[PDB]
Amino acid sequence: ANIDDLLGDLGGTARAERAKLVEWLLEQGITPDEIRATNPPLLLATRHLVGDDGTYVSAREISENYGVDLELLQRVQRAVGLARVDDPDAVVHMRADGEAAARAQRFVELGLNPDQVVLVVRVLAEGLSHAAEAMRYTALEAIMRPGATELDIAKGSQALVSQIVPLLGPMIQDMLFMQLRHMMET
Amino acid sequence: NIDDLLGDLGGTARAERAKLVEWLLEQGITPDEIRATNPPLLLATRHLVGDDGTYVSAREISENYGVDLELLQRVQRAVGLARVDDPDAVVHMRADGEAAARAQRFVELGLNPDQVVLVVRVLAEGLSHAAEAMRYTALEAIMRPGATELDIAKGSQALVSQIVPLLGPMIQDMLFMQLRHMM
Numbered sequence: 001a002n003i004d005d006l007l008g009d010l011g012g013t014a015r016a017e018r019a020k021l022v023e024w025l026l027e028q029g030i031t032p033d034e035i036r037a038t039n040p041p042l043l044l045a046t047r048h049l050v051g052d053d054g055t056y057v058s059a060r061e062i063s064e065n066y067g068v069d070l071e072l073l074q075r076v077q078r079a080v081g082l083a084r085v086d087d088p089d090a091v092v093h094m095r096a097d098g099e100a101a102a103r104a105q106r107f108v109e110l111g112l113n114p115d116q117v118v119l120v121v122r123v124l125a126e127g128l129s130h131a132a133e134a135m136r137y138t139a140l141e142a143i144m145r146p147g148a149t150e151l152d153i154a155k156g157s158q159a160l161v162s163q164i165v166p167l168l169g170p171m172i173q174d175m176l177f178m179q180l181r182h183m184m185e186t
Numbered sequence: 187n188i189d190d191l192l193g194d195l196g197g198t199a200r201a202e203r204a205k206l207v208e209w210l211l212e213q214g215i216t217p218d219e220i221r222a223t224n225p226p227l228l229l230a231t232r233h234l235v236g237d238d239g240t241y242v243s244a245r246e247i248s249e250n251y252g253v254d255l256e257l258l259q260r261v262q263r264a265v266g267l268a269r270v271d272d273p274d275a276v277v278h279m280r281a282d283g284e285a286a287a288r289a290q291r292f293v294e295l296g297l298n299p300d301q302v303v304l305v306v307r308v309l310a311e312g313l314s315h316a317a318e319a320m321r322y323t324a325l326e327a328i329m330r331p332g333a334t335e336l337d338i339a340k341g342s343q344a345l346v347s348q349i350v351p352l353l354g355p356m357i358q359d360m361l362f363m364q365l366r367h368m369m
């Protein structure tokens with residue numbers, strides 16, 4: 001009944017299904033802490049498919065790991081809207097997020113204006129967050145089938161999201177180059 | 187002779203266009219390509235973003251990539267970049283047609299086609315704003331004191347060549363970052 005503190009204030013059917021979901025999440029190496037911190041837990045087991053392995057890093061680690069400037073790194077993280085956690089020593093950044101933010105540096109190395117570069121991140125992040133919303137709803141519609149236990153959905157999202165992820169990177173990339181092409185001809 | 191590529195241009199403007207056309211022809215660009223494109227400036231740069239000059243119809247895309255024509259045309263509308271909604275009109279850049287053809291695979295995995303088409307629409311709109319912020323960013327880096335057409339063309343080709351390899355990986359990383367923070 002360690003699990004009991006993870007079901008929270010839930011009752012009846014919803015508590016028994018959540019208990020099945022929690023048992024399974026624990027076998028997938030999700031810790032009680034990740035489950036308590038994530039409400040609802042349903043898609044904790046799909047997260048590793050989009051690059052969250054549960055490992056964290058500080059801004060200092062990021063800046064030495066990926067060879068980038070800490071000030072610039074901080075500005076980018078703000079633009080993306082992630083971890084306002086201003087302190088550059090707190091180990092509170094998803095590892096994939098630090099890699100992604102460090103790419104900023106190379107555009108500045110080529111002589112692009114640091115301010116314009118942070119701007120582009122800001123604008124891209126705004127657009128993509130809306131697109132991520134609709135994506136989630138889209139995939140939710142697909143997995144959620146009447147008489148679906150919470151565990152049925154979690155397992156079904158693993159199978160579905162697993163198949164979709166390899167297509168998404170190429171898709172968004174094509175969609176960016178489509179805009180660039182038509183901004184050049186335009 | 188170039189003269190008809192130069193047209194009504196006179197003065198400094200003709201003299202500069204002559205040097206740009208000169209360099210474009212040795213870059214392997216045809217007089218044909220230069221006429222249709224005004225100004226001809228980004229012609230030796232647009233290949234870097236996947237515009238090779240090839241054009242296709244929605245029907246050819248449909249047949250060549252084995253995707254549903256009707257779904258394909260909804261996706262093209264959702265991107266919102268070419269005005270002809272005629273299956274046989276040859277007005278889609280080849281790379282745009284392939285990109286539109288990817289959408290059906292999401293549908294064969296159980297995603298609802300109305301939701302997919304809407305996602306395309308929302309993505310297209312987010313990316314067009316970024317793309318304009320990118321254009322201004324690129325120009326600032328390229329445009330220098332009293333630059334000629336040709337300096338601009340050379341500067342843009344060098345700069346885009348260096349940036350493009352980075353851009354794909356970057357936008358893809360940004361999408362996944364948003365997907366990690368979905369709650």
Ligand SMILES: CCCCCCCC/C=C/CCCCCCCC(=O)O
Nearest residue numbers: 043046047135139289292305306365
């Ligand atoms: C031409 C573009 C077509 C658009 C296709 C639509 C894309 C489908 C969206 C992706 C669904 C996967 C979302 C996964 C979210 C995982 C959330 C989590 O980390 O727990």
Ligand SMILES: CCCCCCCC/C=C\CCCCCCCC(=O)O
Nearest residue numbers: 104107117118120121320321323324
């Ligand atoms: C903080 C890191 C963000 C990095 C964002 C990358 C900045 C991209 C800016 C330049 C890429 C744009 C290339 C195409 C622009 C138009 C060029 C042209 O047609 O003249």
